[PDB]
Scaffold this active site. Structure first.
Site, mmCIF file in Angstrom:
data_model
loop_
_atom_site.group_PDB
_atom_site.id
_atom_site.type_symbol
_atom_site.label_atom_id
_atom_site.label_comp_id
_atom_site.label_asym_id
_atom_site.label_seq_id
_atom_site.Cartn_x
_atom_site.Cartn_y
_atom_site.Cartn_z
ATOM 1 N N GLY A 198 3.069 6.908 9.348
ATOM 2 C CA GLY A 198 3.899 6.873 8.948
ATOM 3 C C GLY A 198 4.260 4.895 9.337
ATOM 4 O O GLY A 198 6.292 5.119 8.956
ATOM 5 N N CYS B 7 3.487 2.143 9.013
ATOM 6 C CA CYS B 7 3.514 0.908 8.850
ATOM 7 C C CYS B 7 5.082 0.180 7.959
ATOM 8 O O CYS B 7 5.727 1.266 7.643
ATOM 9 C CB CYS B 7 2.707 1.541 7.304
ATOM 10 S SG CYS B 7 0.680 1.052 7.776
ATOM 11 N N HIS C 58 1.006 -1.589 0.078
ATOM 12 C CA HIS C 58 -0.502 0.129 -0.591
ATOM 13 C C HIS C 58 0.787 1.492 -0.168
ATOM 14 O O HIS C 58 0.036 2.419 -0.521
ATOM 15 C CB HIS C 58 -0.896 -0.071 1.105
ATOM 16 C CG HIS C 58 -0.735 0.299 2.769
ATOM 17 N ND1 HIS C 58 -0.219 1.165 2.752
ATOM 18 C CD2 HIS C 58 -0.661 -0.395 3.620
ATOM 19 C CE1 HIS C 58 0.007 1.201 3.924
ATOM 20 N NE2 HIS C 58 -0.792 0.498 4.590
#
Ligand SMILES: Nc1c2c(nc3c1CCC3)CCCC2
Ligand SMILES: Nc1c2c(nc3c1CCC3)CCCC2
Ligand SMILES: [Cl-]
Ligand SMILES: [Cl-]
EC number: 3.4.19.12
Lengths: 306, 306
Positions: free
Chosen positions: A143, A145, A41
């Protein structure tokens, strides 16, 4: 003595953390050998996340659209591919700090350490468990991830988690390092809700052994029980069913303390039925379930890592 | 979202840990530049520890009696001296992994990370606070002495604690990196007992702000209070007196949430008087006091470190 929620030393993993930017999205990547692993993603805008077609979105991306920075130094991307819900970015330089490592897919009830990162930089480290509903209860902001979860055995880092998603209820969902989600969760912004957060019964028993070893013993009683009787009580309190495999795993702590596993189940049964009456165990007012039996033995005997 | 007891990334400190052996005693040392710092009780036998005369015991030790090993590699000791309750062993090689660092002596109520070590090897990392009675509630087994506590500001490690002693009640006592004990404690095996373990009121309030920020809000009420009224209640429950300096430090969390500090004190007052009624806050059934206001802001905004 003393017993604390303890993470693995984070240095070997700190050495692997990089920043990945695609378009206007920045998150973290894991650099092992000549491959950087990150959540797919990264290619999405916020708009994309309601209904992303990842294969289609990826067609518009080339190697030079993936900006990978290791500290102050840019890495050259020479290839990319999607595997399940992660991207693998081939870079031209092997990470010189690559530790010995493995990828493992853990079972619910197993614990691990998370190195929370933002922009490729470590923020802090904490201990987590894979919940029986396949969530984890983390500390993750926008942020974070691509932050990863891991265990260490002497000199080998076994990576088991990569952070992808927060549910609306504030719990967390992610993948193993092959890009497969734990549980039913998907990398789309949708209605997906966690099931029952059941308590990891074998872990609570381990922690009660830890308490005894450390002098907290007020909850030991004169009773015993059976698996089947105990499990009528576990069911009522949304505890995982205790199995003979669980009993066998608690054997070494039983031997060390001289308290039969079923006697400790009878202590647990009384604590569930009666409450703590305002008392504490190892400085907790509830029954802690994110220490495994292996964790307890490890911490109570002082195992170390190179 | 989510809020976890979080330690600093331990890598910069892992790089500094060595093993120190004197006679039959092995514990840990901290290698910064060309100096290795360790507890002076490395020179003692167990017998010595009831009534050690450190100056006299040290006369019988030469540089070659201090065996310092960094991983698999021996360091050459070219000098030694005693400073308060630590030894400083001068070695012939500067630690190539020395981070930017400082030595700081912290105040009660301040938090820090501990890298637990045995035989110079990291075991795990966890968060601690300097208690108001100048103990810490750690996880330390025989061989862990010389493990250190620290904070990180971007790239600078501020070392504040070195582990020396366990009291009979299972709490822990140690020194700053100048070798001065926190509180009244001494490096002798004697009758020394900890005072009242009072709760760090400013830290509990910070954590209640953390809860609100993360959606746990059931304990907000319709009331307010004053410092003097609140402090009648803190006294009854062995809480530290709240001061105007504490109020000022909570200002940024007050501004972020829009909850006046005194309104949050009134929530805390009701929680102290009424209990949690079987409810939880950020997954705790008691009031957590080992997060500072700076810790909360840091974790809730995602500050990182190089
Ligand atoms: N029954 C109680 C009560 C209080 N506080 C607590 C418990 C359980 C543990 C904390 C305070 C008010 C009376 C009853
Ligand atoms: N008053 C109770 C009782 C029980 N369990 C708990 C509390 C407080 C929170 C846990 C179980 C038995 C009845 C009363
Ligand atoms: Cl551990
Ligand atoms: Cl922190």
């Amino acid at each position: 003595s003393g017993f604390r929620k303890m993470a693995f030393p984070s240095g070997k993993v700190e050495g692997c953390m990089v920043q990945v930017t695609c378009g206007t999205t920045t998150l973290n990547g894991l650099w092992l050998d000549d491959v950087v692993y990150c959540p797919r993603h990264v290619i999405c805008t916020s708009e994309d996340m309601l209904n992303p077609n990842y294969e289609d979105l990826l067609i518009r991306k080339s190697n030079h659209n993936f900006l990978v920075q290791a500290g102050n130094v840019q890495l050259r991307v020479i290839g990319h591919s999607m595997q399940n819900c992660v991207l693998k970015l081939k870079v031209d330089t092997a990470n010189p700090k690559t530790p010995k490592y493995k990828f493992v897919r853990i079972q619910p009830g197993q614990t691990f350490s998370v190195l929370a990162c933002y922009n490729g930089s470590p923020s802090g480290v904490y201990q987590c468990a894979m919940r029986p509903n396949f969530t984890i209860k983390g500390s993750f902001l926008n942020g974070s991830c691509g932050s990863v979860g891991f265990n260490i055995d002497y000199d080998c880092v076994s990576f088991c988690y990569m952070h992808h998603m927060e549910l609306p209820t504030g719990v967390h969902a992610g993948t193993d390092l092959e890009g497969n989600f734990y549980g039913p969760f998907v990398d789309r912004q949708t209605a997906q809700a966690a099931g029952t957060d059941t308590t990891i019964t074998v872990n609570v028993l381990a922690w009660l052994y830890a308490a005894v070893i450390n002098g907290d013993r007020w909850f030991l009683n004169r009773f015993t029980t059976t698996l089947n009787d105990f499990n009528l009580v576990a069911m009522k309190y949304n505890y995982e069913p205790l199995t003979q495999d669980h009993v066998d795993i608690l054997g070494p702590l039983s031997a060390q303390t001289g308290i039969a596993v079923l006697d400790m189940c009878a202590s647990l049964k009384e604590l569930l039925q009666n409450g703590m009456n305002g008392r504490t165990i190892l400085g907790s007012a509830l029954l802690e379930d994110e220490f495994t039996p292996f964790d307890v033995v490890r911490q109570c005997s002082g195992v170390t890592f190179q």
